[PDB]
Amino acid sequence: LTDLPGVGPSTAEKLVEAGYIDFMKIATATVGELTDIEGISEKAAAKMIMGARDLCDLGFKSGIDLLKQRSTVWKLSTSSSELDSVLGGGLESQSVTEFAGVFGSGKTQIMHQSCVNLQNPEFLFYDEEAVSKGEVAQPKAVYIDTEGTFRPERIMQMAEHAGIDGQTVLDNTFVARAYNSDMQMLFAEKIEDLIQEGNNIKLVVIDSLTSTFRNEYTGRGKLAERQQKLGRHMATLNKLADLFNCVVLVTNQVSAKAEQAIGGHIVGHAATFRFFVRKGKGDKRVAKLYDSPHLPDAEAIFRITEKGIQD
Numbered sequence: 001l002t003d004l005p006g007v008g009p010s011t012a013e014k015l016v017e018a019g020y021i022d023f024m025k026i027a028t029a030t031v032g033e034l035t036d037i038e039g040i041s042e043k044a045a046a047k048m049i050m051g052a053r054d055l056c057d058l059g060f061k062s063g064i065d066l067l068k069q070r071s072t073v074w075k076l077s078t079s080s081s082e083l084d085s086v087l088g089g090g091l092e093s094q095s096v097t098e099f100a101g102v103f104g105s106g107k108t109q110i111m112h113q114s115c116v117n118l119q120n121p122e123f124l125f126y127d128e129e130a131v132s133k134g135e136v137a138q139p140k141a142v143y144i145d146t147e148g149t150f151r152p153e154r155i156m157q158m159a160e161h162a163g164i165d166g167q168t169v170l171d172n173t174f175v176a177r178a179y180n181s182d183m184q185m186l187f188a189e190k191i192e193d194l195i196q197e198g199n200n201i202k203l204v205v206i207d208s209l210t211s212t213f214r215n216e217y218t219g220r221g222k223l224a225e226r227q228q229k230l231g232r233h234m235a236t237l238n239k240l241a242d243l244f245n246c247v248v249l250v251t252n253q254v255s256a257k258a259e260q261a262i263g264g265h266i267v268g269h270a271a272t273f274r275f276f277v278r279k280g281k282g283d284k285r286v287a288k289l290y291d292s293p294h295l296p297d298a299e300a301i302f303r304i305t306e307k308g309i310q311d
């Protein structure tokens with residue numbers, strides 16, 4: 001912290017107490033959020049922000065540097081060959097990928113499978129030149145369970161079939177049972193603390209993303225209220241994915257209104273990748289990518305079995 005212009009040992013102590021220890025956290029802060037701290041003046045706040053942006057070299061980039069920035073994105077396999085292909089390799093870090101679909105389509109299964117796959121080094125695809133082995137070492141997941149459907153037994157079973165130690169996954173996966181949108185958002189905001197505590201959070205799951213909000217802001221005369229709160233939550237999720245270079249996954253429910261993911265416009269804009277998961281015959285499922293910034297729409301066929309997601 002004292003490497004930052006204007007920051008002395010006293011100021012550093014204040015910055016850490018307020019949770020600002022990472023250079024990126026400071027480089028992307030506002031004089032306001034910084035001035036809310038004790039003896040941190042506006043000139044001081046401003047100087048350290050500029051310094052941090054500088055140290056993190058956050059300026060104009062062109063040419064090959066654009067490819068290099070894009071190479072810092074690593075991807076997590078879904079265990080499905082077709083889904084990984086439709087995703088352009090796998091689930092992208094630094095982005096929010098949404099899986100929406102009818103009940104039983106497998107949204108929660110995908111979330112569990114991802115927590116298991118995170119513990120298999122061979123399922124994290126990345127360019128060694130842009131992402132070092134250390135950056136993805138001892139990765140951990142955060143599962144924010146909004147409906148109470150987290151199942152340790154499923155994690156174990158999926159792991160065993162993958163040749164992974166079930167307990168190992170449980171030991172490296174943090175679960176937070178949120179009973180409402182307030183807890184849901186607060187937990188998401190506290191993921192920073194788990195990292196500050198030395199936990200390499202590389203996967204964040206929000207299952208479900210919208211169920212709490214829909215139940216709390218029913219009267220369509222309070223819809224604006226809902227969209228606003230939901231928007232702050234999405235922003236927090238997007239920022240955390242970028243700063244901590246981890247993949248963020250969210251599940252969403254659907255309405256008839258042939259259907260559409262709930263959450264309205266705010267969710268549509270904030271989600272980087274959007275899927276619609278359908279049920280085929282028996283254990284067959286179909287994930288339809290219908291929104292992404294660089295990939296074409298496509299469908300991936302897979303199955304949900306005792307082994308989890310496969311094919």
Ligand SMILES: Nc1ncnc2c1ncn2[C@@H]1O[C@H](COP(=O)(O)OP(=O)(O)NP(=O)(O)O)[C@@H](O)[C@H]1O
Pocket residue numbers: 101102103104105106107108109110154157304305306307
């Ligand atoms: N151990 C298992 N063996 C085989 N199939 C399983 C197993 N566990 C779950 N499934 C399948 O997973 C389906 C449910 O998956 P689930 O992830 O809960 O869907 P969902 O989209 O999250 N549902 P919802 O949250 O209500 O909208 C089941 O109905 C089973 O067919």
Ligand SMILES: [K+]
Pocket residue numbers: 001002003004005006007008
């Ligand atoms: K300094």
Ligand SMILES: [K+]
Pocket residue numbers: 103104
């Ligand atoms: K259900």
Ligand SMILES: [K+]
Pocket residue numbers: 147149
């Ligand atoms: K459910």
Ligand SMILES: [Mg+2]
Pocket residue numbers: 094095096238241242
């Ligand atoms: Mg991003």
Ligand SMILES: [Mg+2]
Pocket residue numbers: 107108109149
């Ligand atoms: Mg579910």
